[PDB]
Amino acid sequence: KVFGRCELAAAMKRHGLDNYRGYSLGNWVCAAKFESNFNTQATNRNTDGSTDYGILQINSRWWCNDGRTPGSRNLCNIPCSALLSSDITASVNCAKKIVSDGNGMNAWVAWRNRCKGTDVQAWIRGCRL
């Protein structure tokens, strides 16, 4: 599924992300835009052989099992494939643990490089939340 900006903002809000660990909703939408272009189905392979899955591009080396990242962990205890669903619940619940992990949203390289320090509130403008 390719989410609309406002549609994603709303679903993320319902699933408890707005101000989760102090990150305004605009941050989560911004990160998803630049990680996956709002596409739940996005996959990208990393150099180290792990793969990032879904709307927030969650990595198989630490967070989910995809059966092909040797010596990886499954800290969210989910098949990576579950992160590709049109239902974003799995991705949101797993993002909650990542953003709690100590390094906040810095964990998402595209958020660090493209959202951090910007006016992320622009990402939820016009939206009826």
Q: Which of 18, 35, 48, 119 is catalytic?
A: 35
Q: Which of 7, 52, 66, 119 is catalytic?
A: 52
Whether 52 sits among the annotated catalytic residues: the reply is yes
Dihedral, CA of residue 117, residue 123, residue 124 and residue 127, to nearest 10: 170
Could you give the CA distance from residue 35 to residue 113 in angstroms, rounded to a whole number?
11
Whether 7 sits among the annotated catalytic residues: the reply is no
Kindly state the tokens that stand for 85. Answer: 């669903």
Q: What is the 3-state secondary structure (H, E, C) of 90-121?
A: HHHHHHHHHHCCCCHHHHCHHHHHHCCCCCHH
Ligand-binding annotation for 48, yes or no, is no
Annotated binding site for substrate: 101
Q: Which residues are catalytic?
A: 35, 52
Annotated binding site: 101
